Amino acid sequence: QNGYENPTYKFFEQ
Amino acid sequence: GSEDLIDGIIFAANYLGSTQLLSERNPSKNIRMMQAQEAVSRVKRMQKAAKIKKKANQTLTEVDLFISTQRIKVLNADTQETMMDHALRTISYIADIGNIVVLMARRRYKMICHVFESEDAQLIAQSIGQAFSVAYQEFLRANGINPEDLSQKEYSDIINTQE
Numbered sequence: 001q002n003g004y005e006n007p008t009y010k011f012f013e014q
Numbered sequence: 015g016s017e018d019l020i021d022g023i024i025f026a027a028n029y030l031g032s033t034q035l036l037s038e039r040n041p042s043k044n045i046r047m048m049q050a051q052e053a054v055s056r057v058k059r060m061q062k063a064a065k066i067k068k069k070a071n072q073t074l075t076e077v078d079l080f081i082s083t084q085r086i087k088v089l090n091a092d093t094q095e096t097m098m099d100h101a102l103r104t105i106s107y108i109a110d111i112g113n114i115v116v117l118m119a120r121r122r123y124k125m126i127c128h129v130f131e132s133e134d135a136q137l138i139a140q141s142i143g144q145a146f147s148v149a150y151q152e153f154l155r156a157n158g159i160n161p162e163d164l165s166q167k168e169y170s171d172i173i174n175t176q177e
């Protein structure tokens with residue numbers, strides 16, 4: 001039940 | 015000591031299909047595991063319907079997972095033909111609940127979630143994770159945060175010294 005977010009995505013992207 | 019996945023690695027998995035959904039800028043590693051979980055039921059249920067479709071005659075597909083700081087692309091375990099290719103940045107979140115790996119990238123507010131199955135789902139998510147940061151850190155040093163190494167010997171002394 002582990003999920004990781006992309007610092008890179010959740011950055012420039014959103 | 016890090017070069018490992020800058021070149022990339024490859025895991026054998028099992029594609030079950032996908033499912034498209036709606037997200038809004040910056041949700042939460044909590045609210046994502048939700049949507050992710052409903053993205054898996056979407057295709058599981060889509061598969062039961064798939065199976066049945068076969069009675070009128072197994073249904074999954076074997077793939078390889080190329081993982082790197084650059085992209086994450088799926089290929090035909092047999093034809094070795096690309097089935098999808100997302101530049102890592104366009105990938106926002108992955109999860110490994112059970113031997114079921116699901117990742118979602120920006121379909122170019124409209125996300126697309128891929129659902130695979132692997133007895134290494136565990137190991138598999140972890141890797142993507144490192145890529146995320148390894149990629150992230152690079153996608154960080156190049157921005158002059160050369161002190162990426164330093165910026166953590168900073169994000170700390172900027173927290174205790176914050177008491």
